Amino acid sequence: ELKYIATEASPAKVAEIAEDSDVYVSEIEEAADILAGDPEIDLGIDVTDELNQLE
Amino acid sequence: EKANLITNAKVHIHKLNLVNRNYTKRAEISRKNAKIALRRG
DSSP states (O other): OHHHHHHHSOHHHHHHHHHHHHHHHHHHHHHHHGGGOTHHHHHHHOOOOTHHHHO | OHHHHHHHHHHHHHHHHHHHHHHHHHHHHHHHHHHHHHHHO
16 A cells, blocks of 8 residues: 555655645736736826816 | 737737746746855865
8 A cells, every 4th residue: 555655645746746736826916916917008098287286 | 900910919928928938937046046046166
């Protein structure tokens, strides 16, 4: 049985499946930040001073 | 598919950027080991 555990807790496979998860994690989180990319448009198209009179 | 041709280029830009994240992390990791090894002598 130690052989059968060591077949499938193989450190050759533990390290594979751990590395794969990390790449997908940074792929998804950065794909959330470009999903919030529009602040760069909002801060750009509106620069309106005039309301300092309104202030 | 010339649209997909311009699409594909815009796709690869994200891969190139993805790796640039990865090596940035390793760069700092290596610098941490250097700082330690100096203190190791």
